[PDB]
Design a protein around this ligand. Structure first.
Ligand SMILES: Nc1ncnc2c1ncn2[C@@H]1O[C@H](COP(=O)(O)OP(=O)(O)OP(O)(O)=S)[C@@H](O)[C@H]1O
Lengths: 57, 156, 179, 61, 57, 156, 61
């Protein structure tokens, strides 16, 4: 919704600055999506076939 | 409060807000695994270097500099040649994971100042101070603290 | 076999693998158990060299699924990954050999004792992290154990001798004997 | 020639005749390598002359 | 620590001389790390075929 | 005090500080293995010579001479060609390690004036005097003595 | 066997397989799909990504 409003607007392209562009939310960046894979792929292997450490209670 | 003491207690008891300037800078100092001598780095597919790259032709840069009614904006000789090799190798069985897993590992390390095969500590400027982060010791709680608290504040 | 306890034969008999501990070993150790990622296991880590083993153990399970056709990654219960040997461990691992050694000498009643400094003389002159202590156990048998019998050929070994091994740090080289 | 090889032959016999370590491993396996010409067989023919004084204990396969 | 101070400093690059750059300690050079491999490798090759008679008691 | 006498006693008894000018220069003189005739050098992978090298193109040197907004600073034709050969040979079993030991080796010989396959004595200027060092006879204690004592002193 | 019942032995007698539920199991999915937007799908797509699994199913045939 905010990216189509500035896209359809009659503004010159030299006036489009990074101040005038609204930021994506934190779910939508590469910083989240790359770190979310290490929440899976590192974790996915660190609980496949390995279950002696830190299952104390 | 020393460096190994903080890694156990500050997760349980101590907040980062009550720490002195000589205590914050030493937790951002490199560990004792730094200055330990370590040969034999492990090679992997370097996503940093592009094997399909080429040189500035200077007649493309002239013709693409004069903007208007051109339909392709690169050379496509070394790229096409590369795609033909992947069609001819018949290597699939783990390369179906290599393009799809391994970048996440090296792409996230690009946000921490860490290159591809670098299993050691690499700095990262936050504000006016450097924080040495690792593959393993990410030091993420220091990064959230120094960005939020020391935005308009200075603690060396 | 790792799936169920049964396999048939050419008789189609019921082979039973229950009550049989099945043990799968292989190396797969090059390019990560090397000087790669494992300089100075002297320190060996209460909080840290665990964490290197917290990804080196992951990196083998990458090579487990992509070499073994990963149904073994499904069938096997526990994938054990050994730590590299510490020099603090070989002070007793070498000493675990002398108790097995005297079983071949309890007929003759030679009791053999080794100083800790003597072990340090052995480790620094026989051991590396990369060969895994097998030639150090050849270093015992082919260097030091050869002349205990030569101490016995010529009559310097009474059949009760308290053999005390030590090195007094000159690169001098002595066996201290008590009756 | 090659006294270091000859000592390694003698040491296994010292491991043999003295009641030293003999598991089911046979005493002193050896793999001799060298250029064609040098004393590779006739170490062993002198063993049967000297370890056994018979020369008919030598088993050429 | 000393290499980031001069790196962040507002000095022109022509003023950066080898006199103004602090030297690395002796653990951190190629002269140590190449000689440390001959303390291993050269020592290691002899871990196969340990000499009979060189160590006499 | 002659040359072979010093190799045994000066490790045990004699310090280098009490040695005359005619005694220091003769220990830095080459040994009797020098002037002994020795054919048949043993070939190895020469890390000195680069097989992936090429010629100065003079249109790259002109275009890279005009500094600014270029993205690759070499030719990359001969160095990609080389990498394709290592992918096609399937030679792994000792190339995983013969090179590694060699790099460390031949690299240390570069700090002693000794080239790659040179099993003999090569000089090294220390102060104003040359010291002939070897693969085996490194003569390291002479080098530590002539650098420290003869920094502002002269002993030929 | 799947086409007919009448199967000769090495005595060449017919061995019926009527009233025998024959069950054919194999994987043929291993190390080649591995997400297909689905192994990260516990919700799995109730009207949407079921059609993906149909196109996954079609590919296997
Ligand atoms: N040190 C030695 N003492 C006595 N005779 C020797 C010696 N070295 C070589 N010979 C003689 O040279 C031969 C050595 O025997 P071999 O070791 O069998 O030689 P060979 O030609 O290398 O054949 P191989 O070893 O089976 S390939 C015999 O004919 C010996 O008489």
């Amino acid at each position: 919704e905010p990216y189509l409003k500035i896209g359809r607007s009659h503004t010159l392209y030299t006036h489009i600055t990074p101040d005038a562009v609204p930021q994506l939310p934190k779910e939508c960046t590469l910083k989240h999506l790359s770190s979310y894979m290490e929440e899976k792929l590192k974790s996915m292997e660190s609980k496949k076939n390995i279950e002696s450490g830190k299952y104390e209670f | 409060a020393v460096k190994d003491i903080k890694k156990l207690i500050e997760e349980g008891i101590l907040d980062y807000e009550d720490l002195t300037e000589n205590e914050l800078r030493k937790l951002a100092k490199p560990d004792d695994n730094f200055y330990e001598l370590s040969p034999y780095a492990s090679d992997e597919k370097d996503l940093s270097l592009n094997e399909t790259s080429g040189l500035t032709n200077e007649q493309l840069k002239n013709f693409l500099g004069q903007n208007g009614t051109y339909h392709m904006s690169y050379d496509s000789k070394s790229i096409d040649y590369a795609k033909q090799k992947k069609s001819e190798k018949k290597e699939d069985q783990q390369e179906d994971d290599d393009g799809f897993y391994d970048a996440y590992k090296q792409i996230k390390n690009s946000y921490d100042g860490i290159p591809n095969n670098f299993n050691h500590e690499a700095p990262q400027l936050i504000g006016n101070n450097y924080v040495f982060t690792s593959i393993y010791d990410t030091k993420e709680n220091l990064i959230k603290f120094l960005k939020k608290n020391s935005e308009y504040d200075l603690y060396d | 076999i790792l799936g169920d306890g049964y396999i048939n034969d050419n008789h189609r008999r019921n082979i039973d693998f229950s009550n049989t501990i099945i043990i799968m070993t292989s190396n797969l150790g090059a390019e990560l158990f090397k000087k790669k990622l494992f300089f100075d296991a002297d320190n060996s880590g209460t909080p840290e060299y665990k964490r290197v083993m917290e990804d080196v153990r992951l990196s083998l399970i990458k090579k487990c699924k992509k070499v073994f056709k990963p149904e073994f990654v499904n069938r096997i219960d526990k994938i054990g990954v050994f730590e590299p040997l510490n020099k603090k461990n070989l002070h007793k691992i070498v000493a675990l050999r002398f108790k097995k050694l005297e079983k071949r000498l309890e007929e003759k009643n030679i009791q053999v004792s080794v100083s800790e400094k003597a072990i340090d003389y052995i480790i620094d002159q026989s051991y590396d992290p990369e060969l895994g202590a097998r030639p150090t156990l050849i270093f015992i048998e082919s260097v030091i154990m050869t002349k205990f019998a030569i101490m016995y050929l010529k009559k310097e070994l009474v059949d009760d001798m308290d053999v005390f091994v030590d090195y007094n740090s000159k690169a001098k080289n002595l066996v201290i004997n008590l009756s | 020639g090659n006294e270091d090889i000859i000592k390694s032959l003698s040491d296994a016999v010292v491991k043999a005749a003295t009641g030293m370590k003999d598991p089911e491993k046979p005493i002193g396996t050896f793999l001799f390598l060298g250029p064609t010409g040098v004393g590779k067989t006739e170490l062993a023919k002198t063993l049967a002359i000297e370890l056994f004084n018979s020369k008919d204990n030598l088993i050429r396969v």
